[PDB]
Structures are given as C-alpha cells and as structure tokens.
Amino acid sequence: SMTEYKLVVVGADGVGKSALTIQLIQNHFVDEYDPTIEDSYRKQVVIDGETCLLDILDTAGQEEYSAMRDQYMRTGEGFLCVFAINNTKSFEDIHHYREQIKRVKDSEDVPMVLVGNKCDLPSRTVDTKQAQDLARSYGIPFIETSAKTRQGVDDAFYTLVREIRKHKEK
Amino acid sequence: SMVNPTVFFDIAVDGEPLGRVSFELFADKVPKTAENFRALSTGEKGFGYKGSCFHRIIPGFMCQGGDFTRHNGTGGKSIYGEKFEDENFILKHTGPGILSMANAGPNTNGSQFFICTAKTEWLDGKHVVFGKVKEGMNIVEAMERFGSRNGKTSKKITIADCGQLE
Numbered sequence: 001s002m003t004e005y006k007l008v009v010v011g012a013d014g015v016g017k018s019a020l021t022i023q024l025i026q027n028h029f030v031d032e033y034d035p036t037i038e039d040s041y042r043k044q045v046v047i048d049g050e051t052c053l054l055d056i057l058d059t060a061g062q063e064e065y066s067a068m069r070d071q072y073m074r075t076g077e078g079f080l081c082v083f084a085i086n087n088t089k090s091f092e093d094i095h096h097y098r099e100q101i102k103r104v105k106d107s108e109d110v111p112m113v114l115v116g117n118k119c120d121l122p123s124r125t126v127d128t129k130q131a132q133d134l135a136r137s138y139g140i141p142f143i144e145t146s147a148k149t150r151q152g153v154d155d156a157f158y159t160l161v162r163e164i165r166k167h168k169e170k
Numbered sequence: 171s172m173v174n175p176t177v178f179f180d181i182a183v184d185g186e187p188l189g190r191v192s193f194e195l196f197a198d199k200v201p202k203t204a205e206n207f208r209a210l211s212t213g214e215k216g217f218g219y220k221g222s223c224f225h226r227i228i229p230g231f232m233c234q235g236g237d238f239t240r241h242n243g244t245g246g247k248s249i250y251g252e253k254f255e256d257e258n259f260i261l262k263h264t265g266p267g268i269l270s271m272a273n274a275g276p277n278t279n280g281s282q283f284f285i286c287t288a289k290t291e292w293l294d295g296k297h298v299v300f301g302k303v304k305e306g307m308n309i310v311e312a313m314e315r316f317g318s319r320n321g322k323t324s325k326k327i328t329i330a331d332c333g334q335l336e
C-alpha cells in the first residue's frame with residue numbers, strides 16, 4: 001500500500017523543530033542554530049507495514065504571524081507540538097499551539113503528538129510527569145526526544161502518523 | 171544632510187563587487203540607534219560590519235544582515251554592550267529603502283538590521299527605524315534577486331567595505 005501525510009512541526013523558537021526534522025530527513029544533528037522561516041521536506045517510510053510519503057512542513061517558532069500560520073494548520077493533517085525540556089516557557093506555550101490547531105481545523109479531535117525535546121541535556125526544568133499529565137488531558141501521546149542522540153526521533157513522527165490513521169478510522 | 175551622517179556599504183556577491191549603497195542615518199530623531207550603526211560602519215570601536223553577510227534576503231520584504239560575532243544570523247553586538255533598548259518608535263516602515271533594527275523581542279537591539287524593499291507596516295512599534303537608503307536602491311534591488319522565499323541566498327552577499335561619507 002501507499003498513502004501520504006502532511007505533517008506540520010510547531011512550537012516555540014529554539015526547541016529543536018528543525019533539528020528533529022533534519023535528523024529524520026538527513027540523519028545528522030545540526031549543532032548550529034539556523035533560525036527557520038519555512039522549510040519543507042519529503043520522505044518515504046514504512047510504518048506498521050504500510051508505506052507512506054511524509055510531507056513535513058517545518059515552521060518557525062513565531063508568535064507575530066499567527067494569521068499567516070493559520071494556512072499551514074489548515075492543510076496539515078497532524079501536528080508535532082514540540083517544547084524543550086530545559087525551556088519552561090516553551091512548555092507553557094504548548095496550550096496556545098493546541099488552541100490554534102483546534103481553531104483552524106475546527107475540531108477538538110486533531111491528530112497531534114506532544115514532543116519533549118533535548119532530553120540529553122542536564123538542565124531540565126520541565127518534569128516528565130508535568131508533560132505526561134498535559135498530554136493525558138489532551139488525549140494525545142507524549143514522546144521524549146533528543147535530536148542530538150536521535151533518541152525518539154522516528155518514534156515521534158511515526159506515532160503522529162498512527163494518530164492520523166486512528167483519526168481517519170473514526 | 172547638515173545633521174544626519176551618511177554611511178556606505180560596498181556590497182559583494184561571492185567576493186565580486188556589486189555596487190555601493192549609502193544610507194542617511196536619522197541622528198536627528200533616533201540618535202543612539204543611528205550612532206551605533208554609524209560607528210559599526212566605520213569600525214572605529216574595533217569591530218563592526220566590514221566583512222559580514224546579508225544572511226536573510228526575502229524578495230518583496232527585506233534584506234537582513236549585520237551578524238559579525240556569530241556569523242550565522244544569531245549574533246551581533248552594539249557599541250553599548252551586547253544589547254540596547256528600543257530608543258523610540260517615531261518612524262515607521264513606510265516603504266522601500268527604510269533601514270530598521272532586527273531584534274529578538276523588546277529591547278534586544280545589537281547590530282543586526284534590515285533594509286525594507288516594500289512597506290512592512292506590521293513591524294511598526296516593534297522594530298526601531300533609524301535610517302533610509304540614500305543612493306544605490308538599485309543595488310538593494312539587485313541583492314533582493316539573490317534571495318528566496320525562506321531567505322536563503324543563492325550566492326553569498328557581503329559587506330566588502332563600509333564607512334562614513336563626508
């Protein structure tokens with residue numbers, strides 16, 4: 001079989017949206033910070049035995065162009081909502097991204113995965129339990145990742161595809 | 171001008187001369203911000219714009235540059251320290267040629283700046299406008315063609331020389 005999924009990566013600035021995406025697409029970790037305006041990637045993968053093309057939209061961690069950010073969300077089928085485990089503000093921003101996604105998709109049931117990135121670092125400020133509790137209240141998966149070590153990278157994207165597939169079954 | 175300094179950038183494309191852009195710096199209305207840009211253009215403090223890159227060029231919007239510390243679009247510093255406060259918002263982003271400070275939120279001016287190639291009114295009250303292109307807008311228009319939707323440039327656009335004009 002073959003399907004195709006539009007995935008959109010969102011979250012506050014500097015949390016690792018691009019580093020996660022580049023690990024998935026290019027299998028390397030970028031230590032330099034290259035701020036995003038917008039980037040798009042395509043990758044063929046096999047998830048649960050079902051082949052699919054992932055169209056990934058890597059968005060900027062912006063708060064000013066929310067109106068422009070709405071078109072991204074309209075066509076996206078699933079959303080990776082990323083915060084960094086050493087950036088409490090980025091975690092506090094998550095509910096804003098979820099409210100935005102729900103508004104644009106006109107639904108309370110939108111495929112999404114909460115990603116806590118940078119789990120390799122020793123400077124944690126957000127507790128795993130805090131993130132697990134938030135994800136539970138939304139009814140969505142929570143995945144801890146490190147773009148640096150590649151821990152959880154495939155898991156985050158593949159879990160998002162599973163969430164889309166589950167949503168399409170309803 | 172009898173009051174406002176004029177500075178110039180000699181722009182290069184992969185090291186080859188493209189042309190000169192000169193700027194009027196509005197020291198009459200935005201003195202601290204204009205003085206920072208003037209001094210960074212002459213290099214008189216021991217650091218400044220000479221050699222740095224226009225790292226983000228988006229056609230229809232702006233050309234942004236000025237990171238001479240990290241050389242990657244995240245850095246920069248002012249003559250007053252790493253950052254300085256937003257001086258005023260008297261002037262607005264009214265059209266092509268406006269020179270304004272890049273920032274990462276309130277009171278984070280360093281050295282990065284942008285040159286508008288269109289009216290960018292949504293930046294009013296968030297970026298400090300402090301100058302305008304005097305001569306060489308055709309050179310800015312030429313630089314704009316090396317940009318792309320996401321700001322990445324197809325050739326390296328640098329400030330090969332800069333300074334203050336009489």
Ligand SMILES: Nc1nc2c(ncn2[C@@H]2O[C@H](COP(=O)(O)OP(=O)(O)NP(=O)(O)O)[C@@H](O)[C@H]2O)c(=O)[nH]1
Pocket residue numbers: 011012013014015016017018019020030031032033034035036037059060061062117118119120121145146147148149
């Ligand atoms: N140690 C560590 N550093 C990481 C990790 N992910 C990203 N970084 C670092 O964090 C910085 C920002 O990463 P980046 O992916 O550009 O963040 P972003 O969310 O895409 N930022 P923007 O919203 O501006 O596009 C970079 O210096 C990058 O190397 C991670 O898992 N571990």
Ligand SMILES: [Cl-]
Pocket residue numbers: 064
């Ligand atoms: Cl902006």
Ligand SMILES: [Mg+2]
Pocket residue numbers: 017018019034035036058059060061
């Ligand atoms: Mg990015």
